[PDB]
Amino acid sequence: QFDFRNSMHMLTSNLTFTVYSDLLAFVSADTVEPINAVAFDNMRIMNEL
């Protein structure tokens, strides 16, 4: 049998929230000067001056 007083419920949720996808488009990076590039050991990458 069906009773209306029992099926009633108060669902819980969140008010509002903008779902974000493709997040990395919000960060930009700049190349360092090609000459002044440092690889791993505090030294320039190429040196044939």
Partner: protein, 49 residues
Amino acid sequence: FGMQRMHYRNGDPQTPFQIAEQQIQNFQVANWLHFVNNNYFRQVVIDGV
């Protein structure tokens, strides 16, 4: 003299001739390189000029 060829990085305060002077063993060539390394001008005051 058939020694391993030097890789002088472009930007070190030292000069290739200075490293060569610090490396080689033979007398006359080292003496000539040493002469060409530190041969600087001399400031001399003559007649107010």
